[PDB]
Symmetry: D2
């Protein structure tokens, strides 16, 4: 069908992209980077993140495939030497699609803005101290003071969430995980400490206490938001779809990336 290929931009990924385009020309495969039905990312996980946000408005009509020219990524889980076998299998079709949950972030002001995250979304202060009240389904849970907070998708738990002590989470679970960044706990400040895992339709809201400026990240994107009234996290109704051609289980991918390959 219609397809497009993005590249890390280095010498290896560019020519792998040109070789796959040539191989696709031998089939009923049309290159289209406007309405593709298959998006191939050649590079690292950062390259795949850019490809996802490049087409985050047609997620239900797109199947993503990642090819790792460097090391094995959690999203780019195809080796470069298997590119030709991928072209053939991709041209035929009749493959199985696999869907991972995504994180919806809403930032209200005093017109709201929404973002979609594949890894996570984090909130930090704009210079001074970071203090927010954490509200869960309209119930005040805690007043957090520290460096910041991180809300991760299931597939994002092996990323920033992992470095913050968060738990690793299978992507078949439609949920999101909240982790602390250097929370203060003394006589006057108290947080839960533990990571929190929230199911679908649970809404975690962050509300300012004094400063209303926050540095909000969505995957690699990081924007300074001013006059913030609320930051709302919830599992998105949208999901990302991967084209899967062989069995590469999540825990196997975890083992290869962190234990040994």
């Amino acid at each position: 069908m219609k397809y497009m290929i993005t590249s890390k931009g280095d010498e290896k990924s560019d020519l792998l992209r040109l070789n796959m385009i040539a191989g696709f020309g031998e089939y009923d495969m049309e290159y289209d980077d406007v309405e593709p039905e298959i998006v191939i990312s050649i590079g690292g996980d950062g390259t795949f993140l850019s490809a996802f946000h490049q087409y985050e408005e047609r997620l239900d009509e797109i199947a993503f495939i990642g090819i790792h020219t460097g090391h094995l990524g959690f999203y780019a889980d195809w080796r470069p030497a298997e590119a030709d076998k991928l072209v053939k299998l991709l041209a035929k079709g009749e493959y199985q699609k696999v869907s991972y949950p995504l994180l919806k972030t809403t930032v209200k002001y005093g017109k709201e803005a929404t973002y979609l995250a594949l890894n996570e979304s984090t909130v930090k202060s704009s210079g001074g101290p970071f203090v927010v009240d954490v509200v869960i389904n309209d119930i005040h849970f805690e007043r957090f003071r520290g460096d910041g907070l991180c809300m991760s998708t299931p597939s994002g738990t092996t990323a920033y969430n992992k470095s913050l002590g968060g738990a690793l989470m299978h992507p078949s679970i439609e949920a999101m995980q909240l982790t602390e960044m250097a929370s203060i706990n003394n006589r006057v400040y108290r947080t839960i400490g533990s990571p929190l895992v929230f199911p679908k339709h649970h809404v975690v809201s962050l509300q300012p206490v004094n400063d209303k400026d926050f540095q909000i990240s969505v995957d690699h994107l990081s924007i300074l938001h001013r006059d913030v009234q609320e930051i709302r996290y919830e599992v998105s109704a949208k999901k990302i779809h991967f084209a899967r051609f062989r069995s590469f289980p999540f825990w196997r991918r975890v083992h290869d990336s962190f234990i040994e390959d």
Copy 2:
């Protein structure tokens, strides 16, 4: 209907039990500790754990209620002063049932035995070093050496799982979480470190490397198992049913128990 009441055995819980039995005598409520349809636990979370394992073979025909005479427990979430209002509401019926997932543990030998856990199940060594190979859905994930491993239900994540760095997990999520107890990580030993969260139908198997004797705990029960060949963890098809009369959300219960009440 048919009901029974268990007690912590102290002076306060025994007389609260006798007062509720008397109040139940004014309704169409029959006391039966053989085939009860409502099981009332008066005491702490340990008292509720004993009540659960006391009737773990009729979980689908029983609704549990916990009353905390000491402090607020995650399972005993009714105050003693609300006992009479509980009797009346319980006698009428037409209440809503709430179900939490449970953990199935299977211990094979060289005849297998199965156990049901409401909080967690843990494995430790019988004296010497603890070394097990961790297999996930027939895939070897890691060789663990340390003090032990803990597999927690969602409602158990606020218990032993919490003290081991595990994440707190909403009980609507049908899953189980594995946490490490003092794992060794050097040049020759490597573990994931992070807690792992497994969905339904995922089977985590522990297999001995040298010593085949393990101290296996299931909630408060702790038995020394000899000649062990495998320990299988998976989310149980069985679920525990709570009788719920008012809104007491899980995160609110977490806030009251750990942040402030």
Copy 3:
């Protein structure tokens, strides 16, 4: 002798300062904020930090005293109601001095600058990724990638160092502790993870890998340093001197601030 008093600037601390000045006027006590021999800080730990850096060039000729108008601080360990008893005891003299170690930070460019820290000094990136090589006594120990690194004094271990998992450390130990901020550990990145505690004359040097811009903090001060070639940490030869009038042990102060008071 010569003395000065600094204030948090709020209504309570200003008038407590004026009352102590008046009480000092009844003794052979001269107010001098240029060459004081006793520096009294009225406010929080942040107020005491400002008083320390206000006179960091005459530390060997100054004894510090902290009065906490808000809550008990680790440095402001005198209650406001004990101000008059403090005036009398301070006027007589013949008190015992207590010394805590300090952290020396050196930032070299391509003219070096030195800083003195009572709590800690931290390094973060200027926007992008933070990657530094960690060198210990001219030996390359690790390549760190993450949010940043924190080097704490003994008295600073109960502060930022504590929130990062660092160990609490008695101030009689002349040493410094290094803790990680969200380190990346996968197939390509490896750090020690554990906090490191360094004795006197050990030099920990941070060296850039790509980006040479770093946000370097020294207690409350935080400056963006450009064209950085090296950041050198070592236990300072300088020490801060506290005027001590009664037994208030460090672990007791830890118990009151974190366990209960």
Copy 4:
């Protein structure tokens, strides 16, 4: 001088021992396992621990040397291929001695017993719950409930202490570090959480609350002590002496064992 050699007992270490004995016979070196002045340990760190406790009553008249037949140990820091160069250098003498601090453990009953630890000493319960009051220099610091507590020497911080989140500590620092094993922290139980580092002459005392039976470990030794009234930890006045022939810094040894070799 007088010397002795202990062996792991496997085929490789036994013959390396016999070869060094033969090489020692060509010098003024007398084999004596009763009053040796040089103790050579061939095996792992466990073999070295046994050699230390084998001669813990003549530590001031003994210099220890570790040879690692398996992997590099923190105490056995000599490769087997360097055995002959070690014989020659050891026969000549005039080498530099290096001393590490040790941990003194005292267990009182209702006749006290004292132990010496090179790695650490830990306390756990005898079956039920572990609850102790922690007293620091006669001041009650906390009531600990959990799995247990670990008190580590500086050289022991890279061992069990490391797996419990403790900080790594240079052995030139005469001190001891206390770490928690799965502490309970809720509405009724509160511990410091962070590891604690204690200087010389600080006495940490553990006192029972209910159960007076404890499983107390001292390095590899683990004994069930009954009718316990107190467990006293303090930095020992005794120190272990290593024979050092070349520069092998502690942090370099840490890097090789945990980062890469």
